[PDB]
């Protein structure tokens, strides 16, 4: 009678690469997930010069399950996703979201 | 209608791309200038006050500091921007240059900062538009997808092959087929010894000992090497073509540059590399 265990676990990619940045991740959403308006609100909450109501950011953090998580970048156009810095337990919770396609460890890039 | 112009003397990379064969003639010739075209330089930023860009800096985006001005504090992005569109050192001397700062003052950044820059350009670019990515790293599905989505939005993306003397198909975004992946050559038409190679390249351009702008003063210059220096020659040539054909799709821009490229002149081009060197009659 207690509900079955969740069967959701997004792939977690890139942790083994030598250029992986510890504790930092790119969460990528599936294209069929209705995450766009929440992401747009989170991006707007970071936009210079723009006044935004508190409720939009608070709602977006709830919709995406990012309360308490340190969201650094928000993607809406080149990608649907966020860049976050979270501890292991929070990472495990984000992987249980069925809207998440995969999560990649952030990686260092260099000028060529 | 415009009239053709002659720059003489010209730095060797520009000198090479307006002709089929060696020897160099000390001259760079062009008709179009890239006027009305928008080049988004995804790099360390641009020195906004450089004389090479006077009056032609457009709005940008700083992924390193929210709301920052995207000024270059390293030099790499200014050098790259100078090859695209500097009055003296540039292919497209009338292009608008937009600084998209995704690397810090040491030339280092992250996939997350690069993707943020690509996200900003995809959302806010003005057509006709081209992105220059003189940077890269390990294989990344997220970074490859962001590049593909910029291309699908109608923005040509030109990327450096990398400097490992290895197959470019191992790295992002060099392995993205729909991007124009650029290898580097020397002034005597050899593939530069460091240039990545292989089936993921689209063509070669000058990349060894390239002279361009630098960030330390409004008139500073530097001479450096890398596939990061070859890439902006191609971005500049794309901007010239886009002035002639402002509604061209990325596929059409690539087809035109590959049709016009000089075939079979790159020595030691590497296993499975297309033997094509940038040529501009624009
Ligand atoms: Ca010449
Ligand atoms: Mg290609």
Curated annotation (Swiss-Prot), chain B:
Subcellular locations according to the entry: Secreted
Active-site residues (renumbered): 43, 76, 228
Keyword Disulfide bond: yes
Chief location of this protein within or outside the cell: secreted
Record-listed E.C. numbers: 3.4.21.-
Keywords from the UniProt entry: Disulfide bond, Glycoprotein, Hydrolase, Protease, Secreted, Serine protease, Signal
GO CC terms in record: extracellular space
GO biological process, one term: proteolysis
PTM remark: Contains 4 Cys residues that form two disulfide bonds.
Keyword Hydrolase found: yes
MF GO annotations: serine-type endopeptidase activity
Superkingdom: Bacteria
Domain annotation Peptidase S8: ranges: 11-282
Temperature dependence: Thermostable.
Job description of the protein: Serine proteinase with preferred activity for amino acids with aromatic side groups at the P1' side of the scissible bond.
Family affiliation: Belongs to the peptidase S8 family.
Record's protein name: Extracellular serine proteinase
Native source species: Thermus sp. (strain Rt41A)
Portion held of the full protein: 133 to 410 of 410
